[PDB]
Symmetry: C2
Subunit: 133 residues, 2 copies
Amino acid sequence: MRARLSHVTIPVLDQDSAKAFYTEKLGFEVRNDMTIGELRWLTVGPKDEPEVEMVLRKVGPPEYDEETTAHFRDLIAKGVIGVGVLHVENTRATYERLRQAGVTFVQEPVKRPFGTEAVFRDDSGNWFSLNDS
Amino acid sequence: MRARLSHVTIPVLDQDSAKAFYTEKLGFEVRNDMTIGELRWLTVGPKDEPEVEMVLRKVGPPEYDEETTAHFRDLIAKGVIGVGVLHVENTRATYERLRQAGVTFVQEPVKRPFGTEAVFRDDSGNWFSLNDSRG
């Protein structure tokens, strides 16, 4: 297998809130937003990093059933999903701009082994790390 | 924002099991395996994509409390977590090799507007799409 990861799924509570969060506050660009059938294909990514898209996926019908949407939303809002790590050239500077936009932080920037690290949440409660190596 | 996604988290039920799956069935390489306090930080990734790592994160104590652990493990076993999309040159060929390696596919390969897509599950029950660019 010669594979690459083109898309990462982010489970969201509400696709309009998440589109606004990801574009307005984080400063990602819209890659797709089209509704095919009963489903909105909404994807975003960082400026000039075209080859990974983040899929903003609704946690609710039809894709998810009653008992699963309930339990899964509840976990999302608790911050159980850590989506991954975003590498940036400067964690402290990126932190200041995100703060200014009203992003909340799980962890403020902190010195670590080989760079500065912070942890923010998205509109749904999902976590991302910021690291600058 | 100027950022690159360097790591993606995959929640797993058992890290040894996940390691074996990701390396022995998908052929990813181990990128890190070490312990940071109580937690095992275990990462894997495609041999040709050295700049992204998939973090195989134990759903269990101490990161997650017992109620959370129970609710989360249940939803993972049900296939609630779609990790993302792995792009390959030919989904049908890759489908055949993975099926022969013992990988479960909940969807066989299907032609789509972008190309051909299949869907498999990992050893925890998480799902991935396998996509190519073939009309």
